[PDB]
Amino acid sequence: QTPWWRGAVIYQIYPRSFLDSNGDGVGDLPGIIAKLDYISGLGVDAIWISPFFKSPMADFGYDISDYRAVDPLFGSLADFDRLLEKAHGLGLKVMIDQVLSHTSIAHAWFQESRQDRSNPKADWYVWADPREDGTPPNNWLSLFGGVAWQWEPRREQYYLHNFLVDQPDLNFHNAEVQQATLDNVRFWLDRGVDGFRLDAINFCFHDAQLRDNPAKPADKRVGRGFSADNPYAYQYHYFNNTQPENLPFLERLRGLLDSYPGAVSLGEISSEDSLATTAEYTAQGRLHMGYSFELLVQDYSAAYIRDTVSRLEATMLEGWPCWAISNHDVVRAVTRWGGAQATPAFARMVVALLCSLRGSICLYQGEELGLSEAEVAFEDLQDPYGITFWPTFKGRDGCRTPMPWTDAPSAGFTSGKPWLPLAASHRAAAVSVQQDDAHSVLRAVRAFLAWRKEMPALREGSIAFYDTAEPVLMFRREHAGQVVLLAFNLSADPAELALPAGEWEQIDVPGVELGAMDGGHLRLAGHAVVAAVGRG
């Protein structure tokens, strides 16, 4: 039969900001354990927990100092084991982040490597002599600001960091690094985890020749996790990441995962051509799925969504797609796509729109509540990315403010002072509030997900788009003789178009505004959805 992850809805938890269970203002693993009943009650198929491993928190967990340990800020390894058991009991699968491409500077491996050029781990990180004039070896810049090379006086060499100075890149050309990486993944597989979200998976290998990246003209610059005005955008990223040698390494990773039937891999993939790289990385015998930033950016239109999903479908044959519209790195889609005054109708519509595309789905904590982006004041800024680029890019704190459980000042998230302040917008839309109003976003999302559970064409079916003029996105999902037409109004204004050829019958789609089809014409209010079945 078809794997559990094919079409699954994955709930991304950002642990720092989900539920604080001991009053220090920072979410923790016992808070997740306490809300596993709520998450299961959403109707999602799995959770993905962002990093909770031992970390100085310079990149809030993505700088890992011990790959096999839980940071005391979040709890203990025993806490994680209990979380696994409880989630499996409710029928949830549990995926965790794996950050394979770089470590914290505080990692024992880097503390050893950096000491001299001769120690047993000297070649485990990406070390390079200065140029003859003392400067970094090439023109690579960090995504998070400044050059990608940091001086180490103990070696009279630079080390590479694509991300923060505190995140030195591992040298995957080294066989011992590849083996140690696989062994760490095996450790978590041996605790029973169901899979892994693979952070920055195309960054594992760099070009050993250290070739300069070519310049990219201003009219070609396109941001994916970075602004087109970030200096990083001024280069074609051909040599600092996405190297051919990563392909046999993925095949090693997959071989390991094959030894644990049911374990799944989901790569985070952002490259010069993210869709093409996703297709290559999910070819047979490599990663099971990948997601990219293509639906995580400003572009929002029927033309854009149709063209993006169509190009991936044409490019990716053997892989299974995975789509997301919000996560811990981007402005929440409700605000990013809906604007400053996005209505709850828009929130419910965009979640149904996401879950009606072909592929597995990542749902970020709070999308089920329809939450808006927070406004983080300068004095509250935590994310180094935002501190570096303030004020033209304000960083990622706006989507990392705490989950609103109740409408109290602390929103039930913490008994102390939260590490980031609650958006005021959020406590008016808290879980405890939406849990009562039967017209809330939360109840509509649960209804849509339970409705989707009974529609195999939405979960496994193929997809085919109609060439519609703006603002309607219309397509077919098809599985097992069943065919399902869906039409979404992406605008807040009413719209009308001719129903496509064939014999179609309207079925009600819970949770979203209902548009009407009469004879051969469809007319949808703002952010309305028509779902029909093909009777013929």
User: What's the start-to-end Cα distance of the chain, in Å?
Assistant: 28
User: Which technique?
Assistant: X-ray
Where does 457-494 show beta strands of DSSP type E? 462-465, 472-479, 482-489
Q: Active-site residue among 79, 194, 199, 368?
A: 199
Residue among 484, 379, 371 nearest 434 (CA): 371
Clarify whether 199 is annotated catalytic.
yes
Resolution in A: 1.7
CA distance 241 to 164: 15
Cβ atoms of 401 and 328 within 8 Å: the answer is no
Domain ranges of the chain: 1-103+175-461, 104-174, 462-536
According to DSSP, residue 185 is labeled: H
Which one from 45, 59, 207, 268 is the annotated catalytic residue?
268
Strand partners of residue 49: 13, 96
On the question of a cis peptide bond just before residue 244, with omega within 30 degrees of 0, the verdict is no
Identify the CA nearest to 301 among candidates 228, 353, 368.
353
Contact by Cβ (8 Å): 282, 320: yes
CATH superfamily ID and name for 104-174:
Oligo-1,6-glucosidase; Domain 2 (3.90.400.10)
- How does strand 482-489 pair with strand 462-465? unpaired
Distances (CA, A) of 372 to 95, 114, 241, 339, 450: 26, 43, 33, 9, 24
Q: Calculate the CA dihedral of residues 103, 328, 293, 483 and round it to 10 degrees.
A: 130
277 vs 490: CA distance, rounded Å: 29
Nearest to 194 by CA among 375, 472, 3, 421: 3
Nearest to 87 by CA among 18, 38, 21, 52: 38
The token duo for 116 is: 């001299």
**Residue where the block lists tokens 């178009």:** 497
Residue 508 is among the residues annotated as catalytic for this protein: no
CA distance 87 to 77: 15
